[PDB]
Every structure is written in C-alpha cells, then in structure tokens.
Amino acid sequence: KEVVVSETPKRIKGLEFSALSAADIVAQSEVEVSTRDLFDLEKDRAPK
Amino acid sequence: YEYVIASTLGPSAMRLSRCIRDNKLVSEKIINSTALMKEKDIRSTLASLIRYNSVEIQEVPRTADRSASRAVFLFRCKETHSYNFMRQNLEWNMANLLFKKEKLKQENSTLLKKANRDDVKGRENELLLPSELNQLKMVNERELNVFARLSRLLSLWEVFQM
Amino acid sequence: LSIDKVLKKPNRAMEYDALLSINVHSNNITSGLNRAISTGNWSLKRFKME
Amino acid sequence: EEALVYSYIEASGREGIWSKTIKARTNLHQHVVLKCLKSLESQRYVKSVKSVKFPTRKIYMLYSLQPSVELDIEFINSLLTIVWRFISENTFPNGFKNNVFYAPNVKNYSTTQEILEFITAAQVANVELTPSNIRSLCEVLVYDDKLEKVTHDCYRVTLESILQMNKALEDEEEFSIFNYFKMFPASKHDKEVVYF
Amino acid sequence: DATVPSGRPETYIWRYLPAPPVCIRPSVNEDDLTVKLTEIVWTSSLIKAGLDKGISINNMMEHWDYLQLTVAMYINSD
Amino acid sequence: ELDIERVNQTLNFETNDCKIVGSCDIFTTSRKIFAYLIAILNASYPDHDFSSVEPTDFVKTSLKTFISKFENTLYSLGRQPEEWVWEVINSHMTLSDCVLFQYSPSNSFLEDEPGYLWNLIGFLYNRKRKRVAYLYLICSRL
C-alpha cells in the first residue's frame, strides 16, 4: 500500500562555489519580475 | 550572410548591412543620407542588428573618460566576428534539432519497440489498432522532416567552414 | 527666483507689492535655524563645511 | 547685445542657429535674449525657419532663404521602382523571364546620364529633378541588391531581383528567400533568435 | 574547469539576474534593495521599449551605461 | 503659494547618479484645447516649437491610473510619497471631477537633451475653474 520511506542523518562535507547559469537562475525562480509597480494603489496598497 | 539577414530580419536589414560594409566607419548622420527610410525605422532595424555581431559600434571619447553622454558612435562591420557567431548560431540550431529528434524517439520507445517486434512483416494491419499507426505516421513524418531541416541547415553551415 | 516669476508673466500693468512672497520662504529661516540646532548637523552649502 | 548675435548668425552663416546654443558662448540673461529675438523678428532681419536636422527646435537665420536637405516623404519609395524598372529594360526584353541572353557585345547597361533625362521625360511634380544625387539614389538599389554597378560609373539590374514575380524545385537554394513557405505550429522548427 | 555546465565563461555576464527573496530584503518603508530592483527593471523597460520604438545610439548607450551603473550599485554601492 | 512651494520642494531632488527636476503649477492663463496646451508647452520650454506636432499623442487616460504610477515612481525613487500633496493639488483645483491628459508621443523633444532618462508629464484640465496643472517630472543623469 504505502512505500518504505527511509532517511539517513547526514552532514556537510564541503562547499562548492560557482556562478549560476542563465538556466540555473530560471530553474530556482518562482516569478519573472517585469514591472516597477510595487503596489497597486487601488486595492489598499497591496503588493502587485 | 546578407540574405539570411534579409530573409529573417527583413529586407531593410540587408540594406544597412551593406551600407555599413562599404562605408566601413559610417555614422547615423551618414546612414539616412545613403539610406532612404524614416529615421525611427533606421534606428529600429539597426537596433535589431547590433544584437547580433553583424555590426560593432565604434565610440568616440569626446571627454576625458569614455562617457556616452556627449559622444557620437561609429559603425564598423567586422567579417569574422559576424561570421563566427553565424557559424555557431547555426551549429547550435543544428544540434538542438537532433536533440528534439532523439528525445521524440526515446519517449515513443514503446511504440517503436512494438513497431519492430510484432510487425516484422505484418504491417498491413500492424497486428494492432488504427489509433496509433496514425500516431506512428506523425512520428516518422516528423522523424524524416527533422532530417530534411538538417540537410537544409547543413548547406548554410558548411559555407562558413571554408 | 520667485520675484521674476511674476515679472515675465502677464498682467504687466497690474503691479504687485513684492512683499507677499516673503512668508513663502520665511518658514525656511525658522525651520533651518531650529533644525540645525536641534539635530546638531551643520550643512552649509556656501561655506563647505559638514 | 544685438550685434554679437548677428555675428553668431554669421558664425552659422548658411544654415541657422538654435536659441540654446546661444548660451554656449554668451551665457547672458536667459530672458533678455528671449525677448531680444522677438523684437529682432519685428526688426525684419531674422526669421524662424524649421530644422533640416532633427526637428522641434527654434531655428533662427537672417534673410538668406538658404536651407538644405526632403525630410523623407514616403512618395520616394515609388519613384525608384520605375527607375529600377527602366534600368532593367536595357538588359533584355522582359518577356523572356517566364530566357534569351547575349554575349558581352550588347549593352545591357545604361549610364546614370541617361536615366536623369528619362526621369525628367517621365516627370514628377517635385522641385529639383536634379542630377548628382540620383547617382546616389540608385546607390540604395546597389545596397538593396536590386541592381549592380558596372564600368565604374554605371549600373545594371542583377538577375536575382528579376525573380519578384511571385517545375521541380531545387534542393534548398538559400537565395530564394521569397518562395519558402510557412507551417502551422509544430514543435520541430528552428528560429534564428533561439540561441539568445 | 568547464566539465560543470555552468563552467562556461559567459556565465559571468549578467544576462539574467535573480530577484532575492523578501526574507532577504523585508519592508518595515521600502528596503534599499527593493528600491534598487525596481530601478533596474525600469531601466530594462526603457531599453526594451526603446529598442523597438526607435531610440538613438547616443541615448541607447546612455541608458545602457546607466543600467550597468545600477547593477554595479546593486552589488557593491561603493 | 506656500503649499505649492512645498509640493514643488517635494518634486525636485537628486539621488546617487540621478537628478530629477519637475514641479506642478496651476494657472488659468476637445477641439479648441489642442492649442491651449501647446502654449503651455511653449512657455514651459521656450526653445522648441510646439505648433508643429498638432495631432499628438494625448493619451486620455484615467487620472487614478495616472496618480497610481505617479505614486509608484516615488516609491521607486526612495521618496516615500507624502499623501497631503494629493489633497493640496486637490484643494486648489477640485481634483475629483476633472479630466487628465498626457503629452507622450513616440519620440518626445527631450531625447536629444544629453543625460535624458525618462519623463512623466501630466495635464489636468478643469472646466468650472479653468485651472490646468502642468505636473512634470524630468529624470536626468549627472
């Protein structure tokens, strides 16, 4: 019925440093910021 | 190279790309003398042509630092920067096209495995349903249409290899 | 720069007393003395000290 | 103060002067020179002509009546076509394009000192009809590749521009950009921009 | 070491710019970073609308040196 | 007046590598109004003729939509726009029942000014009071 879920306690062993691609920036994104309008002022200054 | 620009970026983009080529250090005061379009149409189709390496921009530093406030810009037309970009814009498009070929054959693998095993000879009925031989028809059409576009592109690509 | 904003404008024959725009800027004498003592900041544009 | 602005018009001499380029050397009172030119307009010396250059700026010049160039009327898109059609007529009789050609003994070309009389023969209601710029008005047609240059001072129509009239079609010549068709949206297309 | 697909040297030019989370820059009063991001967007809009309406090369470069100035102030601001 | 001087002290400032200069003014001195605004443009900039571009782009938009992004750009310039301004320009002009215009053509006359970045020009025509405000914001670079 349900799947055997397993977890191991883990630990950081290193940091790796690189720049991001143009595809790494989009892959972590949630919205594409396209307007300079922070708030629409007609709906009680809500974040646009 | 002048007609791949003319086919895609419009015929007016062909006009500037040669007018910049012979004058070879031309400015926009000299463009609209030696071209015959409206100036915002000149400043648009030139703007959609600096995005590719078809022209460079030669700045003048009228002040001490290289400020763009009061400075006029000149327009070269380098051969090899404009060609090596067009060499690999095609080469990427040539490789993208095979990427979508192989991705399409690999996601239709259970069709193609059925298309090789059950119907080695019996393909008059496929030993199957007609709801997928039409779907197989639009796979192997696109599988031959992609190599059609490959050979069409490959003639454009091999020019800049010489 | 506000005493010429009436001279180069129409109603040429309608003169003005030039003493009705003094209180437009007289609240900068008060508010600039009071702010510089209260804040302690010393912003003198002419003398160049900060 | 009214004499130095006369020499500054004479510093321009032929075209004219814009009123905020006065302050490049004068930097006088902005309103004294503002009303001086209104009385100088009433003096019947200077006049307010419009810019041959980038427009919407007050251009002043004394009574010289001497502008330059006509700020892109879009009628000129039609006149060079019948220029292009006429210079094509000297190459071959155009009924064969639907294909007889000759050796380099016929004169397929026509020099610019023949069409400039023909454009006055088939006259247009413009103001100049002048030479020494029709020789550059066909230079856009050696940039548009509708005619090529020949014999260092003359021009003749290329073969490829004749093909604007629209058989086993050839295996993707690049040079027939005009007759390659389109496709209702599928997935396996390639565009030039996509490597951006 | 370009074995990693983000190895390539053209990943060090700002084509795309990540907008940071609002946890990184809150609003108590807009933040310093929030007012910088909108300015970058505004300049980009001036540039993208300018490349199609037709703007001169003298002020295309004026905006595009200004867009580079803002992102330079976005990271360092000194 | 004093309040007009305050709201003009609002709209004239300069941040790190930008210089915004604009103001509002109200004075009494759609076929007949096409010439009534180009005189305001001529007096506003006495170096460019504005009798030339007669069929211009007056985007007859809603004033609420205009003051929306007029407030958004003051958020966008680190100003924290102060609300009493919009009553003060109301208090001289009766902002509610009036129509707005905007000179925004394809290529405005400031593109040739060096250091130009963007503008925001607002006309606010009044009928019962004939009070046209010329709200203008010119962002430059120095």
XYZ file of C-alpha atoms in Angstrom:
676
model
C 0.000 0.000 0.000
C 2.497 2.637 1.163
C 6.165 2.838 0.271
C 9.040 2.226 2.704
C 10.454 5.700 3.314
C 13.972 5.922 4.701
C 16.248 8.680 5.920
C 19.856 8.854 6.981
C 21.263 11.553 9.259
C 23.748 13.395 7.097
C 26.439 16.034 7.400
C 28.014 18.782 5.277
C 31.418 17.730 3.969
C 32.246 20.636 1.682
C 31.154 23.778 -0.043
C 31.365 24.135 -3.787
C 31.369 27.569 -5.358
C 30.370 28.537 -8.874
C 28.395 31.153 -10.657
C 24.903 30.330 -11.822
C 23.888 29.830 -15.441
C 21.082 31.644 -17.151
C 19.323 28.317 -16.711
C 20.232 27.940 -13.050
C 18.678 31.316 -12.267
C 15.422 30.423 -14.015
C 15.329 26.912 -12.518
C 15.201 28.289 -8.971
C 12.858 31.134 -9.843
C 9.186 31.449 -8.981
C 8.169 34.671 -10.737
C 9.623 36.823 -13.504
C 9.817 40.369 -12.140
C 8.623 42.527 -15.018
C 7.004 45.708 -13.658
C 8.312 48.520 -11.478
C 4.874 48.859 -9.850
C 5.410 47.616 -6.307
C 1.842 48.235 -5.177
C -1.432 48.656 -6.981
C -2.803 51.658 -5.132
C -6.483 50.946 -5.773
C -6.572 47.717 -3.728
C -5.455 49.366 -0.472
C -1.748 49.332 -1.471
C -1.351 45.579 -1.791
C 1.844 44.088 -3.318
C 1.310 43.900 -7.062
C 25.229 36.055 -44.987
C 23.414 39.051 -46.440
C 20.359 37.010 -47.374
C 19.988 35.045 -44.158
C 19.737 38.515 -42.604
C 17.390 39.583 -45.405
C 15.120 36.554 -45.054
C 14.864 36.696 -41.274
C 15.476 40.288 -40.138
C 13.614 41.757 -43.110
C 14.939 43.159 -46.382
C 15.706 46.550 -44.845
C 18.309 44.913 -42.602
C 20.124 43.795 -45.743
C 20.379 47.421 -46.868
C 22.201 48.689 -43.786
C 24.463 45.631 -43.548
C 25.960 46.517 -46.937
C 25.842 50.302 -46.494
C 27.855 49.844 -43.313
C 30.114 47.396 -45.162
C 31.480 49.720 -47.851
C 31.462 52.990 -45.891
C 33.163 50.925 -43.130
C 33.205 53.607 -40.426
C 29.773 55.126 -41.070
C 27.643 57.113 -38.595
C 23.878 57.564 -38.380
C 24.074 61.042 -39.903
C 25.571 59.341 -42.957
C 23.135 56.387 -42.911
C 19.959 58.369 -43.637
C 21.828 60.213 -46.376
C 22.865 56.932 -48.024
C 19.654 55.139 -46.992
C 16.084 56.191 -47.697
C 13.966 55.190 -44.715
C 12.340 57.005 -41.833
C 14.761 57.628 -39.009
C 12.942 55.687 -36.299
C 12.751 52.799 -38.759
C 16.507 53.159 -39.261
C 17.047 53.300 -35.504
C 14.896 50.195 -35.039
C 16.345 47.899 -37.711
C 19.846 48.930 -36.714
C 18.935 48.176 -33.096
C 17.755 44.675 -34.077
C 21.095 44.158 -35.822
C 23.581 45.134 -33.102
C 22.067 42.257 -31.072
C 23.952 40.000 -33.471
C 27.584 40.630 -34.332
C 26.715 41.863 -37.840
C 27.914 45.324 -36.770
C 30.084 46.615 -33.980
C 29.906 50.112 -32.506
C 32.922 52.421 -32.529
C 32.669 55.053 -29.802
C 34.490 58.369 -29.644
C 35.641 59.743 -26.267
C 34.888 63.451 -26.694
C 35.606 63.926 -22.992
C 38.484 62.501 -20.942
C 36.722 59.373 -19.735
C 34.810 57.341 -22.308
C 31.438 58.842 -21.451
C 28.363 58.158 -23.573
C 26.648 61.435 -22.663
C 28.139 63.658 -25.379
C 29.697 61.240 -27.868
C 28.914 60.082 -31.394
C 29.194 56.405 -32.279
C 30.540 54.846 -35.465
C 29.591 51.553 -37.084
C 32.133 49.028 -38.296
C 31.277 45.720 -39.964
C 33.759 43.081 -38.882
C 33.897 39.962 -41.033
C 34.996 37.252 -38.627
C 33.024 38.325 -35.555
C 29.877 38.455 -37.681
C 30.655 35.074 -39.210
C 31.802 33.019 -36.224
C 28.588 33.976 -34.468
C 26.536 32.966 -37.500
C 28.698 29.845 -37.780
C 27.624 28.602 -34.372
C 24.130 30.058 -34.222
C 23.513 27.536 -36.980
C 25.631 24.874 -35.265
C 23.603 25.185 -32.078
C 20.360 25.099 -34.078
C 21.758 22.081 -35.915
C 22.340 20.294 -32.613
C 19.096 21.409 -30.974
C 17.241 19.869 -33.879
C 18.813 16.458 -33.316
C 18.221 16.767 -29.584
C 14.489 17.050 -30.218
C 14.746 14.197 -32.715
C 16.256 11.789 -30.199
C 14.029 12.948 -27.339
C 10.994 12.215 -29.514
C 12.187 8.725 -30.467
C 13.058 7.903 -26.863
C 9.670 8.911 -25.453
C 7.917 6.897 -28.188
C 10.100 3.879 -27.440
C 7.250 1.505 -26.579
C 5.651 2.421 -29.898
C 8.872 1.833 -31.842
C 9.587 -1.383 -29.946
C 6.108 -2.575 -30.886
C 6.742 -1.261 -34.416
C 9.807 -3.508 -34.744
C 8.812 -6.736 -32.979
C 5.142 -7.616 -33.506
C 5.012 -6.426 -37.134
C 8.314 -7.501 -38.694
C 6.247 -8.246 -41.811
C 2.572 -7.958 -40.852
C 2.236 -4.185 -41.197
C -0.897 -4.236 -43.365
C -2.847 -4.298 -40.086
C 0.214 -3.768 -37.752
C -1.338 -6.615 -35.701
C -2.571 -3.543 -33.778
C -5.218 -0.733 -33.648
C -5.530 2.196 -36.103
C -5.426 4.702 -33.221
C -1.608 4.624 -33.151
C -0.421 3.906 -36.699
C -1.673 7.397 -37.492
C 0.203 8.443 -34.362
C 3.153 6.482 -35.711
C 2.586 8.261 -39.031
C 3.046 11.636 -37.370
C 6.166 10.367 -35.607
C 8.124 9.073 -38.592
C 6.970 12.023 -40.699
C 8.493 14.361 -38.125
C 11.411 11.930 -37.880
C 12.021 12.437 -41.592
C 11.081 16.116 -41.527
C 13.793 16.763 -38.944
C 16.495 15.357 -41.241
C 15.001 17.440 -44.028
C 15.632 20.559 -41.965
C 19.045 19.156 -41.059
C 20.285 18.957 -44.649
C 18.730 22.344 -45.411
C 20.577 23.851 -42.463
C 23.792 21.979 -43.180
C 24.256 23.710 -46.532
C 24.118 27.072 -44.751
C 26.521 25.891 -42.057
C 29.256 24.470 -44.296
C 29.707 27.815 -46.079
C 31.424 29.382 -43.074
C 33.626 26.298 -42.629
C 35.712 27.332 -45.637
C 13.960 83.179 -8.495
C 10.359 83.880 -7.496
C 10.407 87.659 -7.880
C 10.867 87.119 -11.633
C 8.064 84.526 -11.819
C 5.627 87.446 -11.751
C 7.565 89.974 -13.868
C 7.929 87.900 -17.051
C 4.283 86.752 -16.796
C 1.158 88.699 -17.971
C -0.814 91.394 -16.171
C 2.075 93.750 -16.887
C 0.070 96.835 -15.897
C -1.090 95.076 -12.710
C 1.873 95.690 -10.427
C 2.493 93.692 -7.261
C 3.921 94.784 -3.936
C 6.694 92.089 -3.866
C 6.043 91.581 -0.118
C 3.518 88.765 -0.281
C 6.013 86.029 -1.182
C 8.295 86.771 1.785
C 6.378 84.377 4.028
C 6.637 81.649 1.391
C 10.306 81.322 2.318
C 10.308 82.812 5.824
C 9.451 79.354 7.175
C 12.872 78.240 5.959
C 14.701 80.760 8.129
C 12.796 79.465 11.160
C 12.910 75.800 10.225
C 16.557 75.855 9.223
C 17.750 77.587 12.359
C 15.667 75.240 14.507
C 16.734 72.079 12.690
C 20.456 72.793 12.773
C 20.469 73.489 16.499
C 18.232 70.515 17.318
C 19.875 67.949 15.057
C 23.305 69.426 15.630
C 24.047 68.911 11.947
C 25.876 71.675 10.170
C 25.156 71.667 6.442
C 26.440 74.913 4.956
C 26.360 74.763 1.162
C 28.076 78.117 0.614
C 30.825 77.706 3.191
C 31.505 73.983 2.506
C 31.562 72.544 5.990
C 29.728 69.418 7.131
C 23.913 92.773 -27.301
C 22.052 92.697 -30.613
C 25.296 92.869 -32.615
C 27.020 89.801 -31.162
C 24.022 87.636 -32.056
C 24.363 88.951 -35.613
C 27.927 87.615 -35.806
C 26.756 84.346 -34.254
C 24.276 84.003 -37.105
C 27.264 84.824 -39.316
C 29.144 82.147 -37.377
C 26.459 79.800 -38.679
C 26.382 81.725 -41.960
C 24.404 79.330 -44.141
C 22.041 77.125 -42.085
C 20.910 78.856 -38.892
C 21.197 78.820 -35.118
C 19.243 77.286 -32.237
C 18.424 79.503 -29.278
C 20.060 77.449 -26.513
C 23.279 77.161 -28.482
C 23.447 80.932 -27.920
C 24.434 80.216 -24.304
C 27.497 78.200 -25.414
C 29.441 81.470 -25.701
C 27.115 84.207 -24.418
C 25.607 82.703 -21.211
C 23.815 86.033 -20.713
C 20.435 86.535 -19.058
C 18.049 83.885 -20.363
C 15.100 86.297 -20.574
C 16.885 89.299 -22.081
C 17.913 87.206 -25.091
C 14.442 85.645 -25.036
C 12.695 88.939 -25.775
C 15.515 90.336 -27.926
C 14.798 87.811 -30.680
C 11.085 88.636 -30.594
C 11.893 92.269 -31.353
C 14.523 91.072 -33.828
C 11.698 89.182 -35.519
C 9.893 92.532 -35.549
C 13.119 94.134 -36.841
C 12.630 92.167 -40.122
C 16.167 90.787 -40.087
C 15.890 87.260 -38.727
C 13.241 84.612 -39.373
C 12.074 81.403 -37.702
C 12.779 78.597 -40.158
C 12.367 74.920 -39.330
C 15.098 72.356 -38.885
C 16.537 70.429 -41.811
C 18.198 68.450 -38.986
C 16.409 66.812 -36.039
C 13.188 68.822 -35.672
C 11.226 70.647 -32.961
C 13.724 73.353 -32.044
C 13.692 77.091 -32.678
C 15.995 77.723 -35.655
C 16.756 81.347 -36.474
C 18.558 82.743 -39.505
C 18.752 86.095 -41.277
C 17.019 86.658 -44.623
C 19.150 84.260 -46.663
C 16.392 81.803 -47.744
C 19.027 79.047 -47.807
C 18.118 75.668 -46.267
C 19.496 72.238 -47.161
C 18.035 68.734 -47.461
C 13.226 66.241 -48.319
C 12.922 65.003 -44.705
C 11.667 61.645 -46.048
C 8.393 61.980 -47.837
C 7.263 58.385 -48.373
C 6.460 59.042 -52.024
C 10.104 58.330 -52.916
C 9.516 54.607 -52.345
C 7.561 54.643 -55.626
C 9.839 56.714 -57.862
C 12.913 54.495 -57.577
C 10.859 51.441 -58.574
C 10.169 52.828 -62.040
C 13.813 53.874 -62.038
C 14.604 50.222 -61.275
C 12.112 49.045 -63.895
C 13.618 51.276 -66.587
C 17.234 50.276 -65.927
C 16.041 46.666 -66.166
C 14.650 47.367 -69.649
C 18.111 47.881 -71.134
C 19.301 44.395 -70.127
C 16.932 42.147 -72.087
C 13.328 42.160 -73.329
C 11.468 41.212 -70.156
C 9.032 38.814 -71.845
C 11.626 36.031 -71.564
C 11.635 35.822 -67.758
C 8.700 33.371 -67.770
C 15.305 33.262 -71.173
C 17.426 34.599 -74.030
C 20.695 36.352 -73.209
C 23.621 37.545 -75.297
C 27.399 37.828 -75.317
C 29.235 40.884 -73.910
C 28.712 42.773 -77.176
C 25.222 44.043 -76.392
C 24.992 46.961 -73.982
C 22.750 45.630 -71.217
C 23.637 48.648 -69.052
C 22.573 52.297 -69.154
C 24.613 55.033 -67.506
C 23.138 57.461 -64.988
C 23.449 60.272 -67.577
C 20.560 58.630 -69.472
C 18.016 57.947 -66.724
C 18.312 61.506 -65.350
C 16.870 62.704 -68.655
C 14.302 59.896 -68.573
C 13.131 60.880 -65.093
C 12.600 64.378 -66.489
C 10.942 62.807 -69.537
C 8.566 60.900 -67.252
C 8.492 63.902 -64.967
C 7.426 64.011 -61.326
C 5.892 67.131 -59.735
C 8.825 67.536 -57.291
C 11.042 70.604 -57.056
C 14.529 69.510 -58.175
C 14.746 66.566 -60.680
C 18.434 67.142 -60.243
C 21.479 65.008 -61.093
C 24.456 64.202 -58.803
C 22.099 62.634 -56.252
C 20.163 60.246 -58.487
C 23.627 58.701 -58.803
C 23.251 58.126 -55.048
C 19.514 57.379 -55.252
C 20.445 54.249 -57.192
C 23.130 53.512 -54.589
C 20.387 52.298 -52.283
C 19.484 49.859 -55.071
C 23.052 48.568 -55.069
C 22.547 48.229 -51.310
C 19.137 46.567 -51.704
C 20.847 44.341 -54.349
C 18.255 45.172 -56.982
C 20.971 46.350 -59.383
C 24.749 46.052 -59.542
C 27.387 48.527 -60.627
C 29.331 48.116 -63.860
C 32.059 50.018 -65.796
C 32.976 52.154 -62.723
C 30.250 54.780 -63.352
C 27.190 52.787 -64.458
C 24.557 50.418 -63.102
C 22.578 47.401 -64.317
C 19.917 45.166 -62.786
C 21.007 41.908 -61.174
C 19.453 38.580 -62.071
C 18.110 37.789 -58.602
C 15.874 40.858 -58.323
C 14.032 39.842 -61.509
C 12.607 36.874 -59.564
C 9.998 39.011 -57.744
C 7.156 37.749 -59.972
C 5.794 35.536 -57.169
C 8.833 22.709 -62.174
C 10.999 20.582 -59.878
C 12.074 22.926 -57.091
C 15.774 22.846 -56.255
C 17.215 21.339 -53.086
C 17.188 24.404 -50.797
C 18.888 27.226 -52.512
C 19.337 29.872 -49.863
C 18.899 32.678 -52.373
C 15.176 32.085 -52.973
C 14.048 33.607 -49.683
C 10.751 34.723 -51.219
C 9.021 31.434 -52.045
C 9.813 29.306 -48.989
C 6.564 28.663 -47.190
C 5.422 28.554 -43.565
C 3.996 25.919 -41.238
C 1.075 25.719 -38.834
C 2.657 25.375 -35.372
C 4.622 22.174 -34.846
C 7.483 21.553 -32.439
C 10.443 20.741 -34.708
C 11.089 24.225 -36.094
C 14.229 26.304 -35.825
C 14.425 30.062 -35.450
C 17.405 32.358 -35.685
C 16.939 34.041 -32.332
C 16.709 30.937 -30.082
C 20.432 30.980 -29.296
C 19.950 34.165 -27.270
C 37.103 23.668 -15.313
C 34.148 23.571 -17.731
C 33.023 19.993 -17.007
C 30.204 21.576 -14.972
C 27.647 23.078 -17.418
C 27.834 26.353 -15.509
C 31.586 26.279 -16.036
C 31.446 28.313 -19.304
C 32.953 31.821 -19.210
C 29.831 33.640 -20.396
C 28.043 32.803 -17.154
C 29.888 35.772 -15.617
C 27.918 38.376 -17.587
C 24.560 39.488 -16.242
C 22.028 38.176 -18.716
C 19.545 37.083 -16.052
C 19.511 38.498 -12.536
C 17.948 36.687 -9.556
C 15.468 38.662 -7.552
C 16.279 37.851 -3.901
C 13.565 36.592 -1.533
C 11.597 39.083 0.514
C 13.132 37.444 3.585
C 16.484 38.811 2.353
C 15.039 42.302 1.932
C 11.947 42.977 4.076
C 9.734 46.066 4.301
C 9.432 47.848 7.637
C 9.196 51.698 4.436
C 10.733 50.044 1.380
C 14.144 48.460 1.604
C 17.345 49.611 -0.054
C 17.478 46.506 -2.222
C 13.775 46.590 -3.145
C 14.118 50.133 -4.426
C 17.206 49.078 -6.391
C 15.490 46.137 -8.098
C 12.647 48.277 -9.430
C 15.111 50.822 -10.784
C 16.904 48.028 -12.636
C 13.568 46.884 -14.049
C 12.647 50.415 -15.084
C 15.910 50.857 -16.956
C 15.451 47.493 -18.658
C 11.945 48.543 -19.697
C 13.340 51.793 -21.117
C 15.875 49.716 -23.018
C 13.473 47.048 -24.306
C 10.784 49.538 -25.320
C 13.483 51.801 -26.738
C 14.904 49.098 -28.992
C 11.570 48.838 -30.835
C 10.123 52.360 -30.866
C 13.447 53.608 -32.190
C 15.900 55.479 -29.991
C 19.224 56.999 -30.921
C 22.546 55.281 -30.404
C 23.603 58.230 -28.271
C 20.877 57.585 -25.694
C 20.712 53.815 -26.051
C 24.255 53.896 -24.715
C 23.231 56.473 -22.123
C 20.601 54.159 -20.682
C 22.750 51.075 -21.064
C 25.628 52.676 -19.240
C 23.090 53.649 -16.593
C 21.652 50.127 -16.337
C 25.177 48.865 -15.812
C 25.685 51.579 -13.197
C 22.645 50.490 -11.187
C 23.592 46.803 -11.062
C 27.092 47.957 -10.112
C 25.495 49.870 -7.236
C 23.291 46.860 -6.530
C 26.177 44.599 -5.537
C 28.830 46.977 -4.163
C 27.499 50.568 -3.929
C 30.983 51.973 -3.433
C 1.699 79.912 -2.661
C 3.347 78.254 0.320
C 1.743 74.834 -0.157
C 2.540 74.910 -3.870
C 6.094 75.767 -2.843
C 6.099 72.741 -0.519
C 4.865 70.330 -3.184
C 7.454 71.755 -5.547
C 10.132 71.218 -2.882
C 8.959 67.598 -2.925
C 9.411 67.054 -6.655
C 12.946 68.448 -7.103
C 15.773 66.233 -5.872
C 18.789 64.149 -6.802
C 19.924 60.730 -5.646
C 23.185 58.854 -6.328
C 23.684 59.377 -10.100
C 20.240 60.683 -10.993
C 18.771 64.181 -10.945
C 15.001 64.615 -11.096
C 13.622 68.080 -11.754
C 9.880 68.541 -12.068
C 7.102 70.530 -10.497
C 3.398 71.319 -10.559
C 1.749 74.632 -11.360
C -1.853 75.797 -11.649
C -2.958 78.750 -13.757
C -5.997 79.872 -15.730
C -3.983 81.727 -18.396
C -11.646 68.683 -27.243
C -11.070 70.597 -30.468
C -10.188 74.005 -29.004
C -7.903 72.684 -26.247
C -5.308 71.336 -28.703
C -3.862 74.840 -28.978
C -4.497 75.621 -25.309
C -1.828 73.133 -24.173
C 0.866 73.769 -26.769
C 1.132 77.328 -25.463
C 1.778 75.816 -22.028
C 4.432 73.660 -23.669
C 5.973 76.674 -25.434
C 6.091 78.705 -22.219
C 7.366 75.643 -20.366
C 10.251 75.211 -22.829
C 10.945 78.398 -24.836
C 13.368 76.722 -27.239
C 11.143 74.211 -29.059
C 8.113 74.988 -31.178
C 5.004 73.029 -30.255
C 2.755 74.275 -33.049
C 4.420 71.602 -35.197
C 3.089 68.363 -33.676
C -0.628 69.135 -33.706
C -2.128 65.573 -33.898
C -0.026 64.416 -30.965
C -0.443 61.507 -28.562
C -2.664 62.813 -25.773
C -3.465 59.531 -24.062
C -6.772 60.458 -22.449
C -6.319 58.045 -19.542
C -7.882 57.857 -16.109
C -6.403 60.200 -13.535
C -6.474 57.416 -10.947
C -4.343 55.280 -13.252
C -2.007 58.249 -13.690
C -1.605 59.014 -9.992
C -1.101 55.283 -9.391
C 2.196 55.099 -11.261
C 2.929 58.697 -10.278
C 2.950 57.404 -6.714
C 4.725 54.192 -7.745
C 7.661 56.102 -9.195
C 8.066 57.978 -5.916
C 8.188 54.640 -4.167
C 10.652 53.630 -6.909
C 12.910 56.625 -6.205
C 13.185 56.184 -2.436
C 10.893 59.107 -1.647
C 8.027 57.575 0.440
C 5.429 59.819 -1.235
C 3.580 62.064 1.180
C -0.179 61.914 0.837
C -1.088 65.523 1.766
C 0.327 66.629 -1.609
C -2.612 64.972 -3.342
C -5.030 66.939 -1.202
C -3.166 70.213 -1.776
C -3.382 69.868 -5.546
C -6.979 68.875 -4.884
C -7.568 71.929 -2.678
C -6.686 74.391 -5.434
C -8.227 72.545 -8.346
C -11.024 70.114 -7.225
C -9.134 67.028 -8.413
C -12.184 64.717 -8.365
C -14.395 65.944 -11.216
C -11.665 66.778 -13.753
C -10.097 65.122 -16.781
C -6.427 64.294 -17.382
C -4.224 64.484 -20.468
C -0.657 63.427 -21.164
C 1.792 64.512 -23.854
C 3.575 61.220 -24.521
C 4.334 60.930 -28.244
C 6.549 58.356 -29.940
C 9.713 60.474 -29.724
C 9.463 63.336 -27.249
C 11.508 66.518 -27.540
C 13.895 65.636 -24.709
C 15.558 62.612 -26.320
C 18.126 64.973 -27.843
C 18.867 66.509 -24.442
C 22.048 64.801 -23.181
C 21.629 62.866 -19.973
C 17.918 62.271 -20.541
C 16.460 59.168 -18.918
C 12.639 59.368 -18.695
C 9.761 61.761 -18.121
C 6.292 61.926 -16.653
C 4.166 64.834 -17.850
C 0.636 65.354 -16.581
C -2.024 67.782 -17.742
C -5.124 68.175 -15.593
C -7.815 70.182 -17.348
C -10.518 71.844 -15.287
C -13.821 73.097 -16.669
C -15.520 75.103 -13.923
C -12.306 76.790 -12.749
C -10.207 76.574 -15.973
C -7.273 75.539 -13.781
C -4.780 73.434 -15.716
C -1.932 71.962 -13.702
C 1.240 71.096 -15.571
C 2.683 68.281 -13.483
C 6.028 67.290 -14.957
C 8.930 65.127 -13.852
C 12.182 65.045 -15.799
C 14.719 62.493 -14.619
C 18.223 63.256 -15.826
C 21.641 61.790 -15.109
C 24.634 63.520 -13.525
